[PDB]
Amino acid sequence: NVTYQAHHVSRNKRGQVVGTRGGFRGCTIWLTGLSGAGKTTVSMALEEYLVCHGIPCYTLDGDNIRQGLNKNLGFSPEDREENVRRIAEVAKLFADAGLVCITSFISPYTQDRNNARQIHEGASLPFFEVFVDAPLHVCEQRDKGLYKKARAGEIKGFTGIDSEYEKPEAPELVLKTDSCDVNDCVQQVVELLNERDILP
Amino acid sequence: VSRNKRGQVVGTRGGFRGCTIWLTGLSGAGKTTVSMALEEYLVCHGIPCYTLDGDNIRQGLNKNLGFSPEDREENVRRIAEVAKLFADAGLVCITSFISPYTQDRNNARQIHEGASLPFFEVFVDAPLHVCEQRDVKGLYKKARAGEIKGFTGIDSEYEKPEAPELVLKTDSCDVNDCVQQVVELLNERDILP
Ligand SMILES: Nc1ncnc2c1ncn2[C@@H]1O[C@H](COP(=O)(O)OS(=O)(=O)O)[C@@H](O)[C@H]1O
Ligand SMILES: Nc1ncnc2c1ncn2[C@@H]1O[C@H](COP(=O)(O)OS(=O)(=O)O)[C@@H](O)[C@H]1O
Ligand SMILES: Nc1ncnc2c1ncn2[C@@H]1O[C@H](COP(=O)(O)OS(=O)(=O)O)[C@@H](O)[C@H]1O
Ligand SMILES: Nc1ncnc2c1ncn2[C@@H]1O[C@H](COP(=O)(O)OS(=O)(=O)O)[C@@H](O)[C@H]1O
Ligand SMILES: [Mg+2]
């Protein structure tokens, strides 16, 4: 017996109030990829760039989320489904609020990344899937603690070893972090945000 | 990026004002009414905010929860964690959930205060008979007809706050009277200029 309550404030007014030299630019930048591939690195520099150009944003990192909102979830397929589902719902509120939301979660199931997109596109919010792509071995020698414990059978169902990572087929962007610079990665994301009319 | 750097790019006129106004009270007490009219004020005055309403949130993030003691605990736990992210992002976050249990509201507080973010517990306080009279959604009559079990105030409990930052007597005040009480507490804590 739950029935929806409408807001009094439109997106257009929100974009007037949040962003200086306004225009509503609420969206979500969804980073996806193996552990140690470069998602958090890339998302924190993107957040830095954005704040330095007067564009309000927040970063939701799986690791951070997973000690607060999702502290009660593990790494079974079903928990990762629910991990991703909740954060898709959270990110949708941030883009609806007027902010560029940046997420950095492994998010290893295509079905779940597509659901996250539909949550946004349904609500007429732009959703940018960015594949952060570093070869497994590169991600592994970058590690500290986890890959080692996982090869020893102390972390069961670890993405890339024991559990599969499902690659996006045709994302908005692929970031080759083994051959690409941190600033260069960030610039590519900005270039995308330029065309897609988020950054002036 | 630091909170200080956020407050110079988020605000329409500078200074970090991230915080959570947390409304608690009976069904029909006036939570949604106040929060949305409060959301209207803050926006028209150049202050970015966002309302998280228990009914809307239960359509999305919290759609896999019902009204058991434990589910109400999880409902409130999740939105407290979300509200601390909006706060930390520099927005004034307005939540309006029944949040019937004092243990869970104190937990939502601790979540915030342990991140050094302001938390204002606002008791929206109309007695049951008043809320029942209004019965805006037909829920009280349905509850008393035996069509809804464990309804707050009838077959489950509401636990009143012990040290709220603000009580609003919606039975003796009008919407705007109530909105202004809120703003003046916000003025007091340098959230609103
Ligand atoms: N272009 C790049 N992008 C991201 N990380 C890089 C890059 N080049 C080198 N690195 C290194 O790779 C590591 C990236 O790890 P994280 O950002 O922590 O990965 S994450 O995907 O699990 O979030 C950092 O230690 C960083 O110094
Ligand atoms: N079994 C595991 N698989 C992958 N990551 C794990 C596992 N156990 C712990 N972790 C830690 O959790 C982080 C990833 O969490 P998420 O991005 O939240 O995962 S996701 O698959 O559900 O999206 C990793 O970077 C790693 O530090
Ligand atoms: N001062 C007041 N503040 C808020 N609501 C009031 C006030 N006076 C009367 N009301 C009325 O009481 C009803 C409260 O219902 P809701 O706002 O929907 O309450 S809620 O707590 O269940 O969210 C509304 O129809 C509202 O117009
Ligand atoms: N058994 C019930 N008790 C109270 N509210 C209910 C119940 N069933 C449906 N509702 C509806 O759901 C709303 C309560 O949602 P919340 O604010 O999210 O409650 S809370 O107790 O878990 O915080 C009420 O406004 C009412 O519309
Ligand atoms: Mg309500």
Curated annotation (Swiss-Prot), chain A:
GO molecular function per UniProt: adenylylsulfate kinase activity; ATP binding; nucleotidyltransferase activity; protein homodimerization activity; sulfate adenylyltransferase (ATP) activity
GO cellular component term, pick one: nucleus
Residues holding ATP 1: G36, A37, G38, K39, T40, T41, C180, C185
Region (Adenylyl-sulfate kinase): 1-198
Reported effect, R14A: Abolishes inhibition by the substrate adenylyl sulfate
Tissues and organs where the protein is expressed, per its UniProt entry: Expressed in testis, pancreas, kidney, thymus, prostate, ovary, small intestine, colon, leukocytes and liver. Also expressed in high endothelial venules (HEV) cells and in cartilage.
Highest rank taxon of the organism: Eukaryota
Residues that, per the record, bind adenosine 5'-phosphosulfate: D63, N64, I65, R66, F75, R80, E81, E82, N83, I106, S107, K144, G157, F158
Keywords associated with the record: Acetylation, ATP-binding, Kinase, Multifunctional enzyme, Nucleotide-binding, Nucleotidyltransferase, Transferase
GO BP of this protein: 3'-phosphoadenosine 5'-phosphosulfate biosynthetic process; skeletal system development; sulfate assimilation
Task performed by this protein: Bifunctional enzyme with both ATP sulfurylase and APS kinase activity, which mediates two steps in the sulfate activation pathway. The first step is the transfer of a sulfate group to ATP to yield adenosine 5'-phosphosulfate (APS), and the second step is the transfer of a phosphate group from ATP to APS yielding 3'-phosphoadenylylsulfate (PAPS: activated sulfate donor used by sulfotransferase). In mammals, PAPS is the sole source of sulfate; APS appears to be only an intermediate in the sulfate-activation pathway.
Family to which the UniProt record says this protein belongs: In the N-terminal section; belongs to the APS kinase family. In the C-terminal section; belongs to the sulfate adenylyltransferase family.
Comment field on protein domains: The N-terminal first 50 residues are required for inhibition by the substrate adenylyl sulfate.
Oligomer and partners: Homodimer.
Protein name in UniProt: Bifunctional 3'-phosphoadenosine 5'-phosphosulfate synthase 1
Protein species of origin: Homo sapiens
